[model samples]
Target: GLMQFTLPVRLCKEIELFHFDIGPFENMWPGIFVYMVHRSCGTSCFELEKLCRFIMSVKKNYRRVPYHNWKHAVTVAHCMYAILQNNHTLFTDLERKGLLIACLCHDLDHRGFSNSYLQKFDHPLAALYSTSTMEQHHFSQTVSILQLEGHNIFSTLSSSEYEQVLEIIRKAIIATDLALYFGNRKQLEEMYQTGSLNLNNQSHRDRVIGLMMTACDLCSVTKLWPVTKLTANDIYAEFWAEGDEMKKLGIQPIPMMDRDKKDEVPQGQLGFYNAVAIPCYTTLTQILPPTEPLLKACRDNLSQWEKVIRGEE
Candidate 1:
């Protein structure tokens, strides 16, 4: 078949999808976390599952060779879930659900390549979308899967319930767009200082949802030494692979690593950790203390990656 379905062929033909439950390493944490959010936030059970199912469906279709895969989604979900529980502050149920669901499904079908590679190569994904829409599409694809005839994984929900599910899913999924990442971080920092959450108004639900998801999604740096380094290495390899692909296409790689350079891996990793992860997580921890441990873990991992880069590991 031209397309892969998580369900069986006959079932896919009958329903336009495979049995989504058949994919790799299904983690119940995302769903249970979703349910907790619903319970805390008063969102219905149907609403919570829709987002969970959407994430699973996306993970099912993802090509799992190297780089980001279902594992990243699960990792993000676990991290985001832990962040909320650790904070246990004003994160009401809906906020919790939105955050966790977003984490689980944010990079559902990630290709392991960064936006730089996509834009430089003029990949179809970039051609088909602006940065904003590409990320939104990632979420939409998840929703679309459930809406498929044979894929009615969400068939049990009522129309009104479906709309609610869709609304939250869109908010969380669209929130993953990295274009507004810095802006979100700034807003979060300001909120922390004033001791006033800008996330309370009804109109700001979408905005809050986005920011929350982004924060939880980035909990990698806060991970422990063993797990954190492993995840960082995986990310580094993915970036390197994309760099390699760009070099093959006669396109210039990202700034840190030039196509002509033999190995810019160390510098690239160092620069990224210092410039991006370090500052972002440092500020993030000021407001969310639970993130501190994870951030420290991230720093440790960064140093380890530095060793790997220098061939000293």
Candidate 2:
């Protein structure tokens, strides 16, 4: 696996995804995966046991970080599902399933460290990939999970069909890199401005998919105020922890990552939403329209952040 340590797989023995009543918060995730597979990819072509094991393997690969943990993974994928619900056949079944599964594995093995931090601190993964370090690492981890024994959920598919789905998964997962999206966004933004993109066209489809992953990655900001606070708090905790490490190494962390500037956080959120989150869903809803609710929610969340910064709730 080329991981720091190759650990044995967690059987999660008591949680039999195939046989259990999956109402608990944790168990519900596999149920979500299973339901999506049955709906988007033909259920009769899939083996439930393999699908169960595959989802569990993906879940197990995720670290218990404050923000980029299993909960965050599920939230991202769930938001992806909800926004994609009204596509009206804009995407194929394989495309939808690929996006969902890619979301599930997007942050696999995250060390609660940002990509820049990896490059700054000489992490092995940084050495392994010259650019988009963290994103590539995650895609590798996703591929590893799929190749594990009894974990290939797409085993029933023909080799070529399997390759196509994997290609979509890889593309969607890689599209989550904010560094990539910063450039990709402008291309899509221009296309949207000129009304040049139609998702049915292959190149235009690629553009939407790239933009869609960014929207999915930042979807937490568009969530309810209460949940968004919890997730953001966790995210800052992870960021500050990395900052503390950098400080120990005699390097200065940025204000957003630095614990010394705790008061600097809210303003940073305001700036982030203004720069990334606002443009993301704004352009996305323009392209898709089905995610108008998401765009509106993002606007409301920005207002809440502004209020918080202004000495209100």
Candidate 3:
């Protein structure tokens, strides 16, 4: 086809009509992003026309992966919007812009493989970034899209303003990597216990934001039961795809990744909920009181998953 692809007419209309609703509309992502940009930077700093194209291109660039597709990006973006709205006074205008956009583009260009999978196959991404491979690649794609003509939503910013926003986008995107979250969790916990997480401190502010990034990245687990189960199924669809690849190489897949072990999913999820999701949100809710619902949902979901493991669900 000679024509450039565009979003559905309904979606464009929805974007125009979008209010402040934070709930996800998988097909209405383009409109949702426009609302976020409008709220974050306003017409004073950003052009909504440029943002229309930006959101269009961002969603188009995502591969047809099961879990990390553009739909998942929008889901996280919705969580981020909901999150930022909850902590309305927590971040500056530019910080809100960067964080929301970071969440939206965090998984851009994901290839449906874990970072360890890239290393095992010695993928070039692994060589390019020895740590947080997928995250670095995602940010690279975001930068490339921003460089496109008419897609630089930050076009109004001065040199220093531009640099600061890009750095915020960089760290926020990279912090979504679970591998880094564990290391960050310990330091965050120490700060939390000591009551040293002041927003005025540069280090403290960045650390707190990083924690929010992870929480938003894993926000699916914090959803209600139907969304929680549905998202788990979608995510495992990607996991098992990689797992099947391992089988072809004569490597047994982990319980969580193996399709045949579907019955073990509850147990596998328990591991994630306990080790990562619960603790991450635990610290997060304490830091940002308005985000307690997310942590509460995580704990409530954790209990249900445990119940499933115990044959009670």
The model with the greatest lDDT is 3
User: Which rank order by lDDT, best down to worst?
Assistant: 3, 2, 1
- Score candidate 3 by TM-score against the native: 0.90
Q: Best-fitting candidate, measured by TM-score? A: 3
Q: What is the lDDT of residue 291 in candidate 2?
A: 79
Off by over 4 Å in 1: 1-56, 149-165, 194-197, 202-211, 255-267, 302-313
lDDT of 1 at 45: 32
Please identify model 2 stretches exceeding 4 Å from their true place. Answer: 1-24, 39-42
Clashes found in each candidate (C-alpha, N, C closer than 3 A): 10, 0, 1
Span of ten consecutive residues with least summed lDDT in model 3: 13-22
TM-score of 2: 0.89
Q: Show the lowest summed lDDT stretch of 10 residues, model 1.
A: 14-23
1 or 2, greater by TM-score? 2
Report the Cα lDDT for residue 287, model 2.
84
The 10 consecutive residues of candidate 2 with the worst lDDT sum are 13-22
Model 2 scores what on Cα lDDT?
0.77
How much is the lDDT of residue 221 in candidate 2? 82
What TM-score would every model get versus the actual structure? 0.70, 0.89, 0.90
